[PDB]
């Protein structure tokens, strides 16, 4: 009767959209530091999700207004013939807020657009939000404190966070974020096979085992990074290749 | 070199500007009830401050940005010509915030515009904010629970509040608010003679002594109103008539 192995039907003709919001610099009045390396993350994520069959859309340093219009457009277009939805946020964040170029937006405001009632083509479908965001302070490793609350979003939502409270996020000016790097590596090797949450758990291990030299920084020795994910998924999620 | 009876120089050619922000209805999405009788307060306040020599300026149901924009102007014009400054807020409110037609505004960002550094020409001059604001639910008496924190702001600032925590504000739909009514009656009789804080003390008593009649409303027995004021003034304040 009941299937303990039950999985999201991923046999729709399209996989779905992958929304990437990339933010490397900000309105002077926000006094937020640049995010060198975020473009490396953007490019990495782009190819790893393309290879998984997603239609990737990258938007760079959009203002709150254009960002909201643009995500509201994705929320209102049909996903009927799609498997799921992926949205990634690369930027600074604080508590429940992420930052667009010139202002902050509530994550719940972004996720709310795709909930059962508001988005119908995505109902019963995996909705995945990936958030690389923290508090702002040749290759260099920068360390930012965890600042964004790691909360869920609703039924069939998977909220993925680069860092959990009390830990520190890391981003290399050339290679990119520890979290994104490790996620993209796992995606490349196991993305089209492993169950996605178990693949995130892998990412938990890879990031949690990372270390700085302690030879280039005296000001970051011992600041560990442990990501997390809040799942409200109801079935197994796989990205097996499509016909 | 010390005078225990020292007064604010009310010498200047002009008394100063009295700003009044009257809010009667609100943005559908704020889901805030109308404040019938607020226009009566507005007019009452208008007459009494004019009689005290103020250049009264009224605005009805301005949107957050309109309101901000307008008050910011009044803070960036010269008051070097005047004795003091008055600003009245007649709306709904909560915690540190007051309600403009469509959005909340932090009181502290409203008073901050007139502090000694942002407004040199009011340095040493009384800056008086009067706030009739609470939480919403022929002549009818509406009863609203205190919501707005009765805070102070800066040196030579005087914050006057219609009601304190644990008490209830009252507004008649035709005659206006108890606080306003009583404040305006004291102004008419004693405004140009009494020290202004002593006068507010009179208002404290007049309002606190107001009862209802057991039959006007079943749900309003023993919901007394006790106004208060937070003084930061450094001298005595009189509004003796100007020549």
């Amino acid at each position: 009767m009941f299937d303990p192995a039950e999985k999201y039907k991923m046999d729709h003709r399209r996989r779905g959209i992958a929304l990437i919001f990339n933010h490397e610099r900000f309105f002077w009045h926000l006094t937020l530091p640049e995010r060198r390396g975020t473009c490396a993350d953007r490019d990495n994520l782009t190819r790893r999700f393309s290879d998984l069959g997603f239609e990737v859309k990258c938007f760079n340093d959009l203002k709150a207004e254009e960002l909201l219009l643009k995500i509201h457009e994705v929320s209102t277009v049909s996903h009927a013939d799609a498997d799921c939805f992926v949205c990634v946020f690369l930027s600074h964040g604080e508590g429940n807020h992420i930052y667009a170029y010139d202002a902050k937006i509530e994550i719940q405001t972004l996720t709310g657009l795709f909930k059962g009632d508001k988005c119908h083509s995505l109902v019963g479908k995996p909705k995945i939000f990936i958030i690389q965001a923290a508090r702002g302070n040749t290759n260099i490793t920068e360390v930012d404190a965890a600042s964004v609350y790691t909360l869920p979003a609703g039924a069939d939502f998977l909220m993925c966070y680069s860092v959990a409270e009390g830990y520190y996020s890391h981003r290399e000016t050339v290679n990119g974020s520890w979290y994104i790097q490790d996620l993209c590596e796992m995606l490349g090797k196991y993305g089209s096979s492993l169950e996605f949450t178990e693949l995130l758990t892998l990412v938990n291990r890879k990031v949690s085992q990372r270390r700085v030299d302690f030879c280039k920084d005296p000001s970051a020795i011992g600041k560990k990074q442990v990501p997390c994910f809040a799942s409200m998924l109801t079935k197994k999620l796989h990205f097996f290749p499509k016909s | 070199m010390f005078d225990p009876a020292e007064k604010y120089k009310m010498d200047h050619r002009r008394r100063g500007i009295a700003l009044i922000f009257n809010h009667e209805r609100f943005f559908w999405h704020l889901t805030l009830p109308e404040r019938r009788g607020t226009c009566a307060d507005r007019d009452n306040l208008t007459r009494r401050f004019s009689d005290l020599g103020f250049e009264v300026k009224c605005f009805n149901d301005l949107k957050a940005e309109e309101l901000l924009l307008k008050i910011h102007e009044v803070s960036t014009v010269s008051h070097a010509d005047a004795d003091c400054f008055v600003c009245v807020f007649l709306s709904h409110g909560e915690g540190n915030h007051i309600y403009a037609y469509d959005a909340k505004i932090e009181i502290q960002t409203l008073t901050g515009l007139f502090k000694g550094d942002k407004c040199h020409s009011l340095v040493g001059k009384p800056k008086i904010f009067i706030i009739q604001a609470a939480r919403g639910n022929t002549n009818i008496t509406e009863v609203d629970a205190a919501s707005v924190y009765t805070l102070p702001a800066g040196a030579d600032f005087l914050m006057c509040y219609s009601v304190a925590e644990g008490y209830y504000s009252h507004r008649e739909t035709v005659n206006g608010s108890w606080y306003i009514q009583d404040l305006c009656e004291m102004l008419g009789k004693y405004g140009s003679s009494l020290e202004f804080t002593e006068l507010l003390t009179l208002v404290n008593r007049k309002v606190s002594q107001r009862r209802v009649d057991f039959c006007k409303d079943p749900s309003a027995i023993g919901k007394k109103q006790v106004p208060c004021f937070a003084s930061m003034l450094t001298k005595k304040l009189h509004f003796f008539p100007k020549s």
């Binding site: 709150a64 937006i105 405001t109 | 901000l68 924009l69």
Partner: peptide
């Protein structure tokens, strides 16, 4: 000049 520091979506 004026500037919203936080936006949302209604409707």
């Amino acid at each position: 000049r004026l500037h919203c520091v936080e936006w949302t979506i209604l409707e």
